[PDB]
Design a protein around this ligand. Structure first.
Ligand SMILES: FC(F)(F)c1ccnc(Nc2cccc(-c3cccc(N4CCNCC4)c3)n2)c1
Length: 262
């Protein structure tokens, strides 16, 4: 991209030991900014996003090089789903079903495109409107080789364990079905209005919970069929777990049934 066309604002949206995000520009955009191979990760993330064309996935404008390495994408003005919900706890349950269903349409596309996200969390879903969600954060994402059904992580990175399926933790095997597991945690998060999953527990304690067969409980006011769907996403054995075709069709139908009423 051509820096001269881009305009940064002083206030960062988020920061950390990784980098920072800012607002820019005719089209409004979001910019992730570095603070040796953190560039490679960003280029890798840029490479992934370039291949993705879907309404429910944040669309990349491009990458830019100046005082920092910058990834430029379309703006989702309302920001991370988890925070939004925390700040707006009277969002209707129909509207949450709407939002998660949109993530599942996005995830069915990614599944269909044979990409695995590897970081599907409520924090990584951004809101364009109250009624339009997009999937963000493809920094951990991998294209599946033509000859493979999963991505084999060759080392333990800094992993969001509370979002990760047993096969990820146990075998480092990342598939679309691993992302489905995460979708369940994401589902739980959305219906819990941006509560952190497995609160008060270390990652190793979460594994011990799940191995026993213990699951996070039904969020207050979450329809039972949506909690059922979460638990189905939390099938321990990845063979018996649904992919997003099944998951999205479950949500698709339910969201229309819930439209049927009002
Ligand atoms: F992902 C992104 F590149 F930063 C991006 C892309 C497109 N639109 C936005 N929009 C907004 C709008 C408002 C606040 C934020 C924001 C603030 C802190 C952290 C994060 N995030 C980023 C997503 N992953 C977990 C942390 C996002 N973002 C962001």
């Amino acid at each position: 991209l051509d820096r001269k066309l881009l305009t940064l604002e002083d206030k960062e949206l988020g920061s950390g030991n990784f980098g920072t995000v800012k607002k820019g520009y005719v089209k409004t955009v979001a910019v992730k900014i570095l603070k040796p191979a953190l560039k490679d990760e960003l280029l890798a993330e840029a490479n992934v996003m370039q291949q993705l064309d879907n309404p429910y996935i944040v669309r990349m404008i491009g990458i830019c090089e100046a005082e920092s390495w910058m990834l430029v994408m379309e703006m989702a003005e309302l920001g991370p789903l988890n925070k939004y919900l925390q700040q707006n706890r009277h969002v209707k349950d129909k509207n949450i079903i709407e939002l998660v269903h949109q993530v599942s349409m996005g995830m069915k596309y990614l599944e269909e495109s044979n990409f695995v996200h590897r970081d599907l969390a409520a924090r990584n879903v951004l809101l364009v409107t109250q009624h339009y969600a997009k999937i963000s954060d493809f920094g951990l994402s991998k294209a599946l080789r033509a000859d493979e059904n999963y991505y084999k992580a060759q080392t333990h990175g800094k992993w969001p364990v509370k979002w990760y399926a047993p096969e990820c933790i146990n075998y480092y095997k990342f598939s679309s079905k691993s992302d489905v597991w995460s979708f369940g945690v994401l589902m739980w998060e959305a219906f819990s209005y941006g509560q952190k999953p497995y609160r008060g527990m270390k990652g190793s304690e979460v594994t011990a919970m799940l191995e026993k067969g213990e699951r996070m409980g039904c969020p207050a006011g979450c329809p039972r069929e949506m909690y059922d769907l979460m638990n189905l996403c939390w099938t321990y054995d990845v063979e018996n777990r649904p992919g997003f075709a099944a998951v999205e069709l479950r949500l698709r139908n339910y969201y229309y049934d819930v439209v049927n009423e009002g």
